Amino acid sequence: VDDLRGTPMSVGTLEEIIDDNHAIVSTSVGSEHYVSILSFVDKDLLEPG
Amino acid sequence: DVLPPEADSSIMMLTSDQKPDVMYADIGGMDIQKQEVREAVELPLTHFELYKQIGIDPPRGVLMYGPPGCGKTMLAKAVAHHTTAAFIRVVGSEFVQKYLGEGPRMVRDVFRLAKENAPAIIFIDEIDAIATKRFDAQTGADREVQRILLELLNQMDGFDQNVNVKVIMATNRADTLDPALLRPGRLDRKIEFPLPDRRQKRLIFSTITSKMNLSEEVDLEDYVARPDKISGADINSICQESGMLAVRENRYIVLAKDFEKAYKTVIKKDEQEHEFYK
Amino acid sequence: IDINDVTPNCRVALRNDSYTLHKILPNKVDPLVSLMMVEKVPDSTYEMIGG
Amino acid sequence: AHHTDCTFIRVSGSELVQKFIGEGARMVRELFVMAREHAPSIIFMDEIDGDSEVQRTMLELLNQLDGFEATKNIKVIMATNRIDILDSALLRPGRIDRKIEFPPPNEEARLDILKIHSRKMNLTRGINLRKIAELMPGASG
Amino acid sequence: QSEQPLQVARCTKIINADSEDPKYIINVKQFAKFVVDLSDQVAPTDIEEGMRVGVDRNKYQIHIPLPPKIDPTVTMMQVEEKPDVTYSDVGGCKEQIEKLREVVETPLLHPERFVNLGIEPPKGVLLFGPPGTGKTLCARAVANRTDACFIRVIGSELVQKYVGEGARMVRELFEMARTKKACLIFFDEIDAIGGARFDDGAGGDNEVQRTMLELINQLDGFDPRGNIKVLMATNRPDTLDPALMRPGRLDRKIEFSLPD
Amino acid sequence: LTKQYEKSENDLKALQSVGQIVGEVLKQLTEEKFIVKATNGPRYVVGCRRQLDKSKLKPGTRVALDMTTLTIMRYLPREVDPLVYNMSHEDPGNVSYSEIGGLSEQIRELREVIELPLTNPELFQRVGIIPPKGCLLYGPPGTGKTLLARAVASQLDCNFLKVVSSSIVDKYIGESARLIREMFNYARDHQPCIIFMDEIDAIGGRRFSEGTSADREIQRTLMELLNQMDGFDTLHRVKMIMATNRPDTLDPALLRPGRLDRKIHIDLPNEQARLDILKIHAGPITKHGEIDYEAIVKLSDGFNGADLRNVCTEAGMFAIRADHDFVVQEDFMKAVRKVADSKKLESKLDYKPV
Amino acid sequence: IKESVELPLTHPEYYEEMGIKPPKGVILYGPPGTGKTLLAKAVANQTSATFLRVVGSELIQKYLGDGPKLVRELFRVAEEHAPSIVFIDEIDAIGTKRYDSNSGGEREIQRTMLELLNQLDGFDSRGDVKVIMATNRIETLDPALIR
Amino acid sequence: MKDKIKENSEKIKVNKTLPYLVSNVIELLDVKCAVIKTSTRQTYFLPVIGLVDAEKLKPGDLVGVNKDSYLILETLPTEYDSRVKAMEVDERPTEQYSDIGGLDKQIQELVEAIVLPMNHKEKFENLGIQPPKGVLMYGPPGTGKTLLARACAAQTKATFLKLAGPQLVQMFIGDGAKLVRDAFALAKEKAPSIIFIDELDAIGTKRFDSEKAGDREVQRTMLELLNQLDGFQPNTQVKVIAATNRVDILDPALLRSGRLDRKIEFPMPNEEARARIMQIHSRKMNVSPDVNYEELARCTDDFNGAQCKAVCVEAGMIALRRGATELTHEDYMEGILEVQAKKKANLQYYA
Ligand SMILES: Nc1ncnc2c1ncn2[C@@H]1O[C@H](COP(=O)(O)OP(=O)(O)OP(=O)(O)O)[C@@H](O)[C@H]1O
Ligand SMILES: Nc1ncnc2c1ncn2[C@@H]1O[C@H](COP(=O)(O)OP(=O)(O)OP(=O)(O)O)[C@@H](O)[C@H]1O
Ligand SMILES: Nc1ncnc2c1ncn2[C@@H]1O[C@H](COP(=O)(O)OP(=O)(O)OP(=O)(O)O)[C@@H](O)[C@H]1O
Ligand SMILES: Nc1ncnc2c1ncn2[C@@H]1O[C@H](COP(=O)(O)OP(=O)(O)OP(=O)(O)O)[C@@H](O)[C@H]1O
Ligand SMILES: Nc1ncnc2c1ncn2[C@@H]1O[C@H](COP(=O)(O)OP(=O)(O)OP(=O)(O)O)[C@@H](O)[C@H]1O
Ligand SMILES: [Mg+2]
Ligand SMILES: [Mg+2]
Ligand SMILES: [Mg+2]
Ligand SMILES: [Mg+2]
Ligand SMILES: [Mg+2]
């Protein structure tokens, strides 16, 4: 799990939950990305913002 | 590597050709303001040892404030023309730049260039552009302007008594200035440029009309004695329109009718006061 | 680097790629000190107060 | 503040310093986190003279300091030109534990202030500072 | 490894859409602007001008059309836990509850009774009455009984720091309300932003009036509102704008007078 | 085709070319070292090409540097902002002074400040005055301020910068002030030049003491403009024309006679002025029968020039409604009464500079 | 005050057996210095719930919508630390005092009051949050606030 | 040389591969050369323009350049804001001039000023008159202003740009002005075209002088709109329609006779108009042949068109309430009471 996360781990903002394992997240630079939510993420802790 | 201090400056000093042609004699009737500026800017540059011996602490900066058109920028021009020190003319709105960090960078560049070329005078016209008292933390413009103002305060605070650099700020809306800029060590000399008095009005009229081919029939005291609260720019506009009317009728001598018409045109004051109130 | 020396609001140096915290830089200006630098109240003592 | 080694904090309400107080800036009591970090502290606000923001900040800080503040040795000072303009909430007994008047210096106090401030200057011997003090009726420091 | 990250961009213009080589101008947020082409796994008709897309980081070819951007504050305004109040908890409001239900609940539950007779049910209800009379209680009952998307909007939540932001929130609220087959929007204390327009010399309540005008335009404007059935409750209905108090925006005016 | 092959080979040679980063020379350190700042980027210590002059690389000179080594490849003239280029290359519409009625006095005042000083500077030098550089055309809406500016731009043979003040506002930090600076830099580099900023109250409004961040940015733009009109550097052979129908809201520093020297009031037309405007706008109208312009003037009290053009348009529209190929006096009567009726919805117009 | 902010937490069985929810809100009103804030301090001394103290004048913000935002966040924090007691001291000071830093005038104060109305009794379900308000001028409060 | 030409084109195709970097041509120098600004906020100098003729370029032109060499590869169409492109109608609403009751004079006044100049332009050039520029439609809510806008968009083949005031109110400075001028440019490029600005009072609020604060940004947007309507560049190819409930709020510079030549008042529908509106809105409704629309019109004093439509809607509600499949006159009479929204009263002691 640590290897999959890697280092460093950037801090972004959950903009939208497109799917169960897909979400649109915006980094600190204001650029949004359509990325995948990995399994070990606590998916019940995910809300917009 | 370490670059020379005078290098890496987006702002340049005033060259010989860039010196304004305005003289102290060109400015009419600001003896109080001239004396305050000289005692706070041009005298400490040449007589810092005298200031130290007497015990006076020379003011690091000068804030020139007053109604618009009352000789602020022109007095700065005259200082630049009649100084043996370096002059660095700048405007507050120039510091606000798209590239984040370039504003404070060029502020410290200006101060570093002035320090490296001491004696030097830094003139920042329209200081309200980077010295307002209200800042919105969620807007990039206000954040950058706050950074610029903080860098300006730090640069003025980092100038010990040894460095021979004098700072001049000019504004006509000093009520909107941040009080932190007026703290001791930053701007210890607030010189007001008020509207001309009657004696000031006649001095300005004489100085401006001395350059114009008038006729002996023109009596400037007719317009000086008028109770209109006009600025030096208003007087210059009155003389300019008198010359304009003289030119219109293909004349190279300004008569009294031209001056009367020019005064009526320029002042153009609506009564705005009903007689029943007094 | 000891984790107990990594206090909040400390200045640290992070490696180029891994961003690994590899040095605790000298602490920045205290926010109170920074605020009072711009406020710049004149320092005083009882000896300079008369009457 | 200097003699008791109490940290002197000036609260002018200026937005320029807000970034140092805190990124929130929604309440002035956000400054307390800084003050507690520098206890003993003296929170100072001067009313230059709508309603006064300095007196509102006084009311909020005093309300916090009444019984809801854990750390001690956090004192609070106002400076104001007039006492009859203060809000009735601030003039209520128990809020301001001591009100101190600073009348304009009389002849002797003016002489003392003159002696203090002329000491920083190259003075010729024999200056009659008493006469100059008499020459400044109703003067401030 | 397999699932590559996709940067979110916005399509701007389609050049040569008719031919077999259509080029798409995309605006990658704060990053840049590019002229790209669709990937082989996306139909040409699945990408339209002005819609958000997701592109790769190498050639920025459009890889997936994306839902429109909605403010998170607007997203949280939709109700996900229904209140614990039923219509049995409201007494003395039989006629008021019936009138409210036949507008906000009956058309959604049994639309077949309305389409057959060529009947267009009212799409707006204003509950008004003195405080404590049961306006928000009836709204909570509606939200508990409803099956469609229920969005609770408090008027004070539509007041924003910056100019035009409240109108933007209203626009996005009606945009995300239109992404559902049937939807209900509750405007509690609509007098916060629904006040009547006035000119007091200065800019008195200009921004709030613009927010109210945007809400009015969404309710009944050039574009059809959709299947949204709005619901507003206020204890000061006399302050509401006449254009907001007009049928087609607030068709039913249910009075929650004091109980007999 | 041989020429087709030549063009294809030209494209091939052009394809190997690489763009060069545009920066600005800050300071020559040594004979082979320079400090240059990219247009929007960091400052670099770079080299210079041996074949370059190195004497045209004064501080502030725009340069093109290699993409890889950042070596100064070339020196370029001062850049013209595309917005400023659009300002200069804006078609006024070939408007002549014969299309303006009742403003002969105002036209003369405007041409006294913008025309004569640029053609006969010694005429004003002999008297001993500096000719005015700024005029403000103010008045109720529709009186002909923009029409006057268009006629001036069409007739006067001089460089003209035409812009609307609301069109220079940009959301980027310091961009509007930079646009003002580039406008005045172009005007200085292309003397003689005239800058017409329409609807100056967009950015020339009074400076707020308790405004928002956007208001502060707009005020920074305004008083960058103020420093350009009358600041430390004297403006030579550049004239400024500013038009607004609400001069009461303008900043007092902008209205100061050092910047806006003349205040030309484009007032509502009087009886003779209304007659002139009606004759101008009813000229190309096909009519039979006597046309008593005097009656329309008498019932046109309070109208503006746009009002009288609308009177002509509505007279033609009444003609069309009756299926006619001509306009008679009765159509003008109905048109002027209809325009007078529509004039009741307009609020106060009497606004003057303070 | 004990029957509303202390007894419901220490002895909820009384209310459960009686079939009534405890009194929702409490406002302490009276002449200055009578002991309203002292009683609030005494409640805060012997409470097992999180105590949040806010002065009414603190709800007046410098930007539009920031007042309602602050009230909304205050009650969100109250909901997070449930059970909790929200002490809105000197509530009347939100209206009896006008500061020029408030961009919106009385209308922004009214919007903040409407947000407070929604938080006290509105659409959103309220957890174990008890509200205590104190004021020496209760005649200046909006009657819908203390309904 | 044909094979060499084809191989050169093949190499160009390799270099001309997507993606392009979108840039704006800033300047054209001679020592033939270009200066461009990429969307990455980078300014580049191109000694050779590239695959685009330098004559076909002007400052501000949108181009697609090589992502690596930044050499101009092609010229791109004019860039308009996505909101402006989204405010252009393409469904072309299905209304008709027969669906509007009691506004025949208003429909005629709008059509002969917006539609007639576009179609029958020869009626104006022969007359030598300029066609009316801009039409404002002001009146009480529910009079049928937006309905007439929908009808005008229905019966016109010209490009239609639906728009509301609050859409032009933007957070950032110059964004509203950019939107207004982009909409007008888009309408110009698709001329003949009509721009409908609903709720004009959102941006049309009168300017004012203040010392502390004010809404100068919305006034800047309004000033941009004023310049677009009648400014330095006379735009006589785009027709402008605006609508408002409160004409007393609008800036007098907006109500000018060059910007909004015709200011049509939409009145309360009179008795015949009210009956006609009820008949219009009862078309798709199963109504018994005994309803007296004249009587309903007599019973609906001070009813706007929206209230008249709501009368039919509530009559349908009541018919469904009692289970009847046909609407009777009593249903309309009782729905008039519902639309009136009279407060509950026990005034049975009168008379
Ligand atoms: N004492 C004076 N004697 C002669 N001319 C004067 C005097 N004061 C001002 N002027 C005139 O003022 C004009 C320019 O005004 P100036 O720039 O000095 O004003 P300011 O205080 O800097 O104005 P603002 O606050 O608007 O920047 C000059 O043309 C000059 O003739
Ligand atoms: N008709 C009713 N039947 C039963 N209980 C009622 C009724 N009306 C009010 N109540 C009770 O009184 C409380 C008043 O709160 P409610 O949300 O209904 O008020 P409101 O009408 O929205 O007031 P406000 O205008 O101040 O927002 C309800 O929570 C409920 O417990
Ligand atoms: N004196 C005039 N002679 C002829 N036409 C005039 C005159 N004044 C105004 N007009 C006509 O009025 C219309 C609008 O005039 P213009 O655009 O110059 O207005 P303006 O003064 O700039 O008003 P606003 O303050 O609204 O910008 C034009 O069609 C123009 O022909
Ligand atoms: N009834 C009382 N018994 C004991 N002490 C009291 C009593 N009333 C007030 N006090 C004392 O007075 C002090 C100040 O009173 P307190 O601040 O509680 O009054 P308040 O009514 O809330 O006033 P305000 O309206 O000014 O906020 C308290 O800390 C307490 O020590
Ligand atoms: N004269 C009319 N004839 C037919 N239908 C009408 C008439 N007036 C209004 N309506 C009906 O009213 C409804 C809404 O009217 P519309 O939106 O056009 O009003 P408006 O005057 O533009 O309103 P607002 O000023 O509030 O924007 C439509 O369903 C329309 O059919
Ligand atoms: Mg000046
Ligand atoms: Mg409620
Ligand atoms: Mg104009
Ligand atoms: Mg208390
Ligand atoms: Mg409408």
Short mmCIF file of C-alpha atoms in Angstrom, two decimals, chain B residues 1 3-4 6-10 12 14 20 68-69 73 76-77 80 87 89 91 93-94 96-99 102 105 109 123 125-126 128-129 132 134-136 139-142 144-145 172-173 176 211-213 233-234 237 239-241 243-244 247-248 250-252 254, chain F residues 24 26-27 29 33 35 37 40-43 45 59-60 108 112-113 116-117 123-124 126-133 172-175 177-178 181 207-213 216-217 220 223-224 226-227 230-234 251-253 256-259 261-262:
data_model
loop_
_atom_site.label_atom_id
_atom_site.label_comp_id
_atom_site.label_asym_id
_atom_site.label_seq_id
_atom_site.Cartn_x
_atom_site.Cartn_y
_atom_site.Cartn_z
CA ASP B 1 27.56 33.36 -8.43
CA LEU B 3 25.63 39.46 -9.18
CA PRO B 4 26.64 43.11 -8.66
CA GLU B 6 23.36 47.61 -9.14
CA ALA B 7 22.64 44.86 -11.68
CA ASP B 8 19.36 42.94 -11.91
CA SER B 9 17.00 45.91 -11.71
CA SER B 10 13.93 46.28 -13.92
CA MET B 12 16.39 52.36 -13.92
CA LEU B 14 16.89 58.95 -14.16
CA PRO B 20 12.51 67.23 -16.14
CA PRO B 68 -5.17 67.12 -7.02
CA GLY B 69 -3.26 69.68 -9.04
CA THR B 73 4.33 65.88 -8.92
CA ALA B 76 9.02 66.11 -7.41
CA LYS B 77 10.07 67.12 -10.93
CA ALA B 80 14.78 65.68 -9.64
CA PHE B 87 16.56 60.00 -8.73
CA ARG B 89 10.99 57.89 -10.49
CA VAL B 91 4.52 54.91 -10.04
CA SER B 93 0.64 50.96 -10.27
CA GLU B 94 3.85 49.79 -11.96
CA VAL B 96 1.43 45.31 -9.64
CA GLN B 97 2.42 42.67 -12.21
CA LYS B 98 0.94 39.44 -13.53
CA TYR B 99 4.00 37.38 -12.58
CA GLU B 102 7.69 40.22 -9.47
CA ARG B 105 11.02 41.68 -6.39
CA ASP B 109 15.21 46.03 -6.72
CA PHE B 123 9.78 58.89 -5.80
CA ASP B 125 3.77 58.72 -7.47
CA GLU B 126 0.21 57.60 -6.73
CA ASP B 128 -2.41 54.47 -3.17
CA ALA B 129 -1.90 51.71 -5.75
CA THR B 132 -4.42 50.94 0.54
CA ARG B 134 -8.07 47.18 2.78
CA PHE B 135 -6.97 43.73 1.60
CA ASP B 136 -9.06 40.76 0.48
CA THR B 139 -8.22 37.68 -4.33
CA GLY B 140 -4.85 37.39 -6.04
CA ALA B 141 -4.68 41.12 -6.72
CA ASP B 142 -5.07 42.08 -3.06
CA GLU B 144 -0.02 40.51 -4.35
CA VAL B 145 -0.56 44.14 -3.34
CA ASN B 172 -4.21 62.98 -3.38
CA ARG B 173 -6.27 60.43 -1.41
CA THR B 176 -7.23 55.80 2.00
CA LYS B 211 6.29 83.31 -19.61
CA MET B 212 3.38 84.71 -21.66
CA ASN B 213 3.34 87.87 -23.79
CA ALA B 233 -3.56 73.62 -12.13
CA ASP B 234 -6.69 75.77 -12.38
CA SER B 237 -5.46 76.35 -17.16
CA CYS B 239 -3.52 81.30 -18.35
CA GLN B 240 -3.46 78.53 -20.97
CA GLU B 241 -7.00 79.33 -22.11
CA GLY B 243 -3.33 82.18 -24.56
CA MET B 244 -5.71 79.90 -26.46
CA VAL B 247 -4.18 82.46 -30.58
CA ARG B 248 -7.71 82.00 -31.94
CA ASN B 250 -4.46 85.50 -34.56
CA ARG B 251 -2.77 87.43 -31.75
CA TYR B 252 0.55 87.00 -29.97
CA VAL B 254 -2.99 88.31 -24.46
CA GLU F 24 13.84 42.00 -22.15
CA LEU F 26 17.92 44.19 -18.00
CA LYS F 27 21.66 44.84 -17.77
CA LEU F 29 27.16 42.40 -17.11
CA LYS F 33 27.14 38.18 -20.30
CA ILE F 35 20.88 39.79 -17.47
CA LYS F 37 14.02 38.99 -18.03
CA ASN F 40 6.36 36.40 -18.24
CA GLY F 41 9.05 34.43 -16.45
CA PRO F 42 12.27 34.47 -14.45
CA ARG F 43 15.42 36.52 -14.95
CA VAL F 45 22.19 35.43 -16.85
CA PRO F 59 18.60 48.07 -20.80
CA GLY F 60 14.91 47.69 -21.53
CA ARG F 108 -14.28 74.30 -32.93
CA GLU F 112 -8.59 73.92 -31.18
CA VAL F 113 -6.95 71.41 -28.82
CA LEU F 116 -4.00 73.25 -34.43
CA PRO F 117 -1.31 72.32 -31.84
CA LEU F 123 1.48 79.54 -33.09
CA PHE F 124 1.07 78.63 -29.42
CA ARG F 126 4.91 82.45 -29.62
CA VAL F 127 2.21 83.44 -27.12
CA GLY F 128 3.98 81.45 -24.41
CA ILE F 129 1.55 78.67 -23.53
CA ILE F 130 1.59 74.89 -23.76
CA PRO F 131 -1.51 73.85 -25.74
CA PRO F 132 -4.07 71.74 -23.88
CA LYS F 133 -3.62 67.98 -24.13
CA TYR F 172 -5.43 39.41 -14.64
CA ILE F 173 -3.39 41.11 -11.93
CA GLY F 174 -2.13 44.45 -13.23
CA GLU F 175 -3.19 43.77 -16.82
CA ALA F 177 -2.74 49.17 -15.98
CA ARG F 178 -0.26 47.50 -18.33
CA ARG F 181 0.91 51.92 -20.16
CA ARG F 207 -11.92 56.23 -6.15
CA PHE F 208 -13.76 54.29 -3.45
CA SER F 209 -12.48 54.52 0.11
CA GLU F 210 -14.25 51.30 1.16
CA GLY F 211 -14.49 49.40 -2.12
CA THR F 212 -13.74 45.81 -3.05
CA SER F 213 -10.57 44.28 -4.47
CA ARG F 216 -9.00 48.69 -6.05
CA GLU F 217 -7.68 47.10 -9.25
CA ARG F 220 -4.95 51.26 -9.93
CA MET F 223 -4.38 56.26 -11.59
CA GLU F 224 -1.89 54.61 -13.86
CA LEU F 226 -3.65 59.58 -14.34
CA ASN F 227 0.13 59.25 -14.10
CA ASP F 230 -0.11 64.24 -16.19
CA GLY F 231 2.70 62.58 -14.28
CA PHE F 232 6.46 62.75 -13.81
CA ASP F 233 7.13 62.30 -17.54
CA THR F 234 5.63 65.12 -19.60
CA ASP F 251 -12.51 61.01 -10.09
CA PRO F 252 -11.59 64.62 -9.21
CA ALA F 253 -7.98 63.93 -10.19
CA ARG F 256 -8.33 68.11 -12.92
CA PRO F 257 -7.44 70.71 -15.60
CA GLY F 258 -3.87 69.39 -15.72
CA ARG F 259 -5.19 66.20 -17.33
CA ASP F 261 -7.81 70.67 -19.71
CA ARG F 262 -11.06 71.42 -21.56
#
